Amino acid sequence: PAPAWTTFRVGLFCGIFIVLNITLVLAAVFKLETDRSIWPLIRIYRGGFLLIEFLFLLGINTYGWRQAGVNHVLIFELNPRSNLSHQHLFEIAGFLGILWCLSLLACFFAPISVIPTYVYPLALYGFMVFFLINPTKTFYYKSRFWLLKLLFRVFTAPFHKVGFADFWLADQLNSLSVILMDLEYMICFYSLELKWDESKGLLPNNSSGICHKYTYGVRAIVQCIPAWLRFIQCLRRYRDTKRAFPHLVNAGKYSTTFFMVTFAALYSTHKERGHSDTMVFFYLWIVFYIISSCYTLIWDLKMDWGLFDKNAGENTFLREEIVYPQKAYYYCAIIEDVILRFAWTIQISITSTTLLPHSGDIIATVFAPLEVFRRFVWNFFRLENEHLNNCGEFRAV
């Protein structure tokens, strides 16, 4: 257990965060002009929010692995004597949340001299970078170095051998692609959409512009960076092991992401010019996003977790040896993993008709956190099945 002050700091930051969030809500309800546009701020802060909300759930994941004898430290190939318990993750998440809440509160009131308001969204992320690559031996220097080595080995060519940490982080990126998109948005917005002379330009000067729409495919390209990484890693694992089934079908699972993304982007772009087969590119997209979903869903239950097993009839469609205490848990997860993997059926269908303007954005940002929550649920069973089945073949018996 963390000796005496890590728990105290966890509580301190958790206590500051709640009241800062309530102050944020109240200031948003009351002291907003409701005259100029408001969407750029949401699109810029959505990334930081669902990153802090990713760390806060990874903490609970660590706790859940520890309290069930999973032995995750041996799986990840981590140093046995030194490793981060859940309290350190809670504390880092709380500190980043305090910084994020402060930087967002500083744009609503904007209590400051002539210096503009568009500095806080930048500076915040600057800190989030200058805290990660800090060369000094302070603020978890033993952790960020391993994190950066892993992130470099993942974000690169298949030149490196694939281990469980590489695959795990590359897959976590796959269900986290809103930060990448919602960082390219900030870059492209500060590039050619913000007039620096206006000291309030962070909120646009009217109640649109070419910043978000799929125009030159840059957004469509960045939509699947992680899919590319996982595809290439599966190809490399096959090249090095020559067993076709698992890794080839895995790469097939990710190719559907390429297909769905390109079809959706092409349909959305041809809608503008009013081309002929806008009914076709709308249909075919829906086809791929269907099969892709199925191609993923089965793989989450058959190969990832391994629940629908032939034997273990007493456990009623579970494994023969389960770890977590209460069986009912699994069942709910299944239902949840069936719902939240679909995800995109309700929001395209909510947008059947033009109910209101900025129809797309509001559903898009209410589903991102549920997407990152599905990944928080996925780990509990991926790591568990890895513990007592070696379904990945990383470990050599």
**Binding region for ligand CLR (CB under 6 A) out of 45-53, 60-68, 103-111, 342-350:** 60-68
> Least distance from C-beta 65 to a second copy, angstroms?
18
Burial 294-305 (b: 16+ CB within 10 A, else e): ebbeeebbeebb
Residue 55 and residue 89 in contact, taking contact as beta carbons nearer than 8 Å: yes
9 forms part of the interface with a second copy (CB under 8 A)? yes
Tell me: is residue 319 an annotated ligand-binding position.
no
> What are the C-alpha distances in Å from 97 to residues 20, 89, 129?
10, 12, 15
User: Which pair of structure tokens corresponds to residue 65?
Assistant: 């692995």
Closest CA to 39 of 356, 364, 358: 358
Range 62-121, binding ligand CLR (CB under 6 A): 64, 67-68
Tell me: is residue 236 an annotated ligand-binding position.
no
Considering CB distances under 5 to 8 angstroms, the limit depending on partner class, which of ligand CLR, a second copy, ligand 8PE, none binds residue 23?
a second copy
Q: How far apart are CA 349 and CA 144, in angstroms?
A: 42
> Least distance from C-beta 1 to a second copy, angstroms?
7
Range 10-49, binding a second copy (CB under 8 A): 10-16, 18-20, 23
332 forms part of the interface with ligand CLR (CB under 6 A)? yes
**Binding region for ligand CLR (CB under 6 A) out of 143-151, 161-169, 221-229, 324-332:** 324-332
> Least distance from C-beta 308 to ligand CLR, angstroms?
17
Closest CA to 128 of 47, 19, 12: 47
Kindly tell me which of 10 and 44 has the beta carbon lying closer to a second copy: 10
Kindly tell me which of 45 and 330 has the beta carbon lying closer to ligand CLR: 330
Tell me: is residue 361 an annotated ligand-binding position.
no
The structure tokens 């030194």 sit at 82
Residue 343 and residue 363 in contact, taking contact as beta carbons nearer than 8 Å: no
Q: Residue 59 is which amino acid?
A: G
How many positions of this chain bind ligand 8PE (CB under 6 A)?
23
**Binding region for a second copy (CB under 8 A) out of 4-12, 50-58, 307-315, 323-331:** 4-12
Q: How far apart are CA 176 and CA 47, in angstroms?
A: 9
7 forms part of the interface with a second copy (CB under 8 A)? yes
Residue 231 and residue 255 in contact, taking contact as beta carbons nearer than 8 Å: yes
